[PDB]
Ligand binder design. Structure first.
Ligand code: F2V
Ligand code: F2V
Ligand code: MG
Ligand code: MG
Ligand code: MG
Ligand code: MG
Lengths: 196, 197
């Protein structure tokens, strides 16, 4: 009944990603194969990366979610995402969240909560992240004029949409700008509307 | 400030289901860069590779439930809690795929509520895209009294209905209880529900 991995064979390994053929035992006692994807960068970390839900709080204003718009070569187009990135060797999820947030948007934030490791596309890959909810005090002088510090090859546009109408604003962006919205962002947006 | 685009896409390795390409693209400064990209081989004329279904089970004098599925995922080497999901067949509408997948995996006959534009699953890694299809399930209808699944070859599914009003804590309890990974879309949905109250 219980399924498990028998063995993994490397098909192709690049600098960043690899393709494996996975042999596994199905519930009926029959062994099957599966073409799996993995990052090559995972080490002693609980997950590959962090995604940050940055809630920007200014008084006398709506709460905003801070998103980033980037060109994504795999997608061959621009995407709207939660700020995200790899957890560095020895770095905690919480710390990687704040750093990524500051690198991509400039905002200095405070941890609110940190998810367990969640899978990005379990049908395709073993990639996991921690989803980290961060509040940004946008009345602090820190965040008055936020200063992005992007690394080499990081071209990032910051986009702050209101929480209270996030789903509609995202759909407007897709129709207007012909962007692709991230699935995690859209799931979040949906739930806000579906809450009772 | 210049706009970015694909220059070329060179195949590195193609399987029956997934392949790895080397993408060359132009960055904003006018310098060419490369990227190791993942793509599914099954895509054709569909607006997306697949669908994920948010099934809201509605019953009189019961709290709304979200219907999730637990499956072994070879890439993860373990069981995962996910929204019902699969590929869109050739010529199939996303809505039609959502309903089919939900009935095959769970046995529930849903009704369409809303359907998203194509959204990306992991755009830093792959081009994989889906429509997120919100579906209501009338639990009081007799068709949905005792749902009869019908999984295809190599499909092995457990149905898990958690209340909407307490989804996040119920998922936490499931992770604490056994070795399990919650899907990122599931967790993001549950987070928003909490954050909305
Ligand atoms: C069947 N099979 C055998 N070796 C394989 N080797 C590799 N893959 C396989 N599959 C079959 C098709 C799939 C089953 C689950 N799939 C899937 C599940 C979920 C999603 C969604 F919507 F969440 F994104 C999508 Cl797009 C697709 C397709 C991967 C393999
Ligand atoms: C830099 N680079 C050059 N060729 C490449 N070829 C391939 N890859 C690359 N990268 C670099 C690292 C990454 C940049 C964005 N990344 C990333 C972005 C998002 C997530 C998250 F958390 F959302 F899942 C994660 Cl885990 C990682 C890593 C992929 C390549
Ligand atoms: Mg306010
Ligand atoms: Mg980074
Ligand atoms: Mg970054
Ligand atoms: Mg299926």
């Amino acid at each position: 009944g219980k399924q498990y991995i028998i063995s993994e064979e490397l098909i192709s390994e690049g600098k960043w990603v690899k393709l494996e053929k996975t042999t596994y035992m199905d519930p009926t006692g029959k062994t099957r194969t599966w073409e799996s994807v993995k990052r090559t960068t995972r080490k002693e970390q609980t997950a590959d990366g962090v995604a940050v839900i940055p809630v920007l709080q200014r008084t006398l204003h709506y709460e905003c979610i801070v998103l980033v718009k980037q060109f994504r070569p795999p997608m061959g187009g621009y995407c709207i995402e939660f700020p995200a990135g790899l957890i560095d060797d020895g770095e905690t999820p919480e710390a990687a969240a704040l750093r990524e947030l500051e690198e991509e948007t400039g905002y200095k934030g405070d941890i609110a909560e940190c998810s367990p490791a969640v899978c990005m596309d379990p049908g395709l890959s073993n990639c996991t992240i921690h989803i980290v909810t961060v509040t940004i005090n946008g009345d602090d002088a820190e965040n008055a004029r936020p200063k992005p510090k992007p690394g080499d090859g990081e071209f990032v546009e910051v986009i702050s949409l209101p929480k209270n109408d996030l789903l509609q604003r995202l759909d407007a962006l897709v129709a207007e700008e012909h962007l692709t919205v991230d699935a995690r962002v859209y799931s979040y947006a949906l739930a806000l509307k579906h809450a009772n």
